[PDB]
Amino acid sequence: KPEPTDEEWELIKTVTEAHVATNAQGSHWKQKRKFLPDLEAFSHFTKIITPAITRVVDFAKKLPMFCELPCEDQIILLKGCCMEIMSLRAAVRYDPESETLTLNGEMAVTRGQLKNGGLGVVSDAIFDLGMSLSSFNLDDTEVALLQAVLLMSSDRPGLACVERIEKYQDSFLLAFEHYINYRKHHVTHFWPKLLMKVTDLRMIGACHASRFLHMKCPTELFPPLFLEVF
Amino acid sequence: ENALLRYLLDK
Ligand SMILES: COc1nc(C(=O)NCC(=O)O)c(O)c2ccc(Oc3ccc(Cc4ccccc4)cc3)cc12
């Protein structure tokens, strides 16, 4: 089982740091955690998504690979992966005790709350993903690398540098698999199971964008950065 | 369109 080469240890350092610097209340999200009590539950939800989107943008900008792409590609990739990454970041903070996910590193929500907030079935998918990820014990590095894989999706429509984005994805997937080899998780077939979690996150991304098209509720009720990334 | 994304992206 090959382990990370020197240059992959370097890329792992870079992508882990980008994640840790833009991940809300890193490793102090549970003690600093409040709970919440209809286009009013949606209201409470839309006033808090803007900083979650802002952090994803911030994460991408700390990837030199991302910064080398032309702005029109950068916009398209962020539109594609933004809800996938906020969803992963929320799912890795599933608390089995309270049965909550954590948004913006301080707000605990239940399945029912997120659903009433307008996510519909996507709420059930994010919670099932969180429950199945408790036994995966993903560290900052594995989360950062999943995020980089989702960001560098060559298949988003209207991209100019399809080939280059594909090569970045391949570099991240190889380093990630090598790191996974090194970490020797106590879960059979770990890497195949992780590729299936990527697929789950991509379905969350495509269902999220689908649901947005269906919730024309006046658009002005929704924050601008949230109607841009759909 | 994507006027705010473009703002946050350039810096
Ligand atoms: C998985 O989502 C989210 N994740 C995080 C997160 O964990 N961030 C990373 C980190 O904490 O580091 C957040 O902070 C969020 C903050 C607000 C939020 O609000 C909503 C609520 C309902 C809808 C319904 C909808 C669906 C489709 C179309 C139109 C409307 C939309 C948005 C969703 C968040």
Any ligand 1 atom below 6 A from CB of A88: no
Find the CB nearest A228 among B4, B10, B11.
Answer: B4
What 3-state DSSP class applies to B11? coil
* Structure-token pair, residue A59: 């994460």
Taking alpha carbons only, the member of A48, A60, A49 closest to residue A22 is A60
A3-38 burial: b if 16+ Cβ within 10 Å, else e: ebeeebeebbeebbebbbebbbeeeebbeebeebee
> Given an 8 Å threshold on Cβ–Cβ distance, is B2 in contact with A75?
yes
A105: CA distance to ligand 1 center in Å? 12
How many whole angstroms separate alpha carbon A83 and alpha carbon A98? 23
Q: Is A156 annotated as a binding residue?
A: no
Tell me which of B1, B7, B9, B11 to substitute to probe the interface with A (most A C-beta atoms closer than 10 Å).
Answer: B9
The closest alpha carbon to A57, from A28, A86, A29, belongs to A86
Domain spans of chain A, in order of start:
1-230
Q: Which amino acid is at A47?
A: K
Resolution value, angstrom units = 2.4
The verdict on a CB contact (< 8 Å) between A61 and B6 is no
CA A154 from chain center: how many Å?
17
The sheet with strand A107-109 has its strands ordered as A34-35, A107-109, A101-103
User: In 3-state terms, what secondary structure has residue A107?
Assistant: strand
Q: Does the annotation list A19 as a binding residue? A: no
- Check pocket membership of A104 for ligand 1, CB cut-off 6 A: yes
A210 burial via Cβ count (<10 Å: 0-12, 13-18, 19+): exposed
Cα–Cα distance measured from residue A149 to residue A171, given in angstroms and rounded to the nearest whole number? 9
Between the CA of residue A8 and those of A38, A62, A121, A145, what are the distances in Å? 47, 17, 37, 11
Task: Select from A39, A208, A229, A30 the least CA-distant residue to A129.
Answer: A208
User: Is residue A117 lining ligand 1, measured as CB closer than 6 Å?
Assistant: yes
CA-wise closest residue to A79 among A63, A95, A56, A102: A56
**DSSP letter (8 states) at residue A28:** -
A92 lines ligand 1 (CB under 6 A): no
What's the distance, CA A204 to chain centroid?
Answer: 10
Within chain A, residue ranges assigned H as helices are 6-21, 41-61, 64-67, 71-91, 111-114, 121-133, 140-151, 162-183, 190-214, 224-228
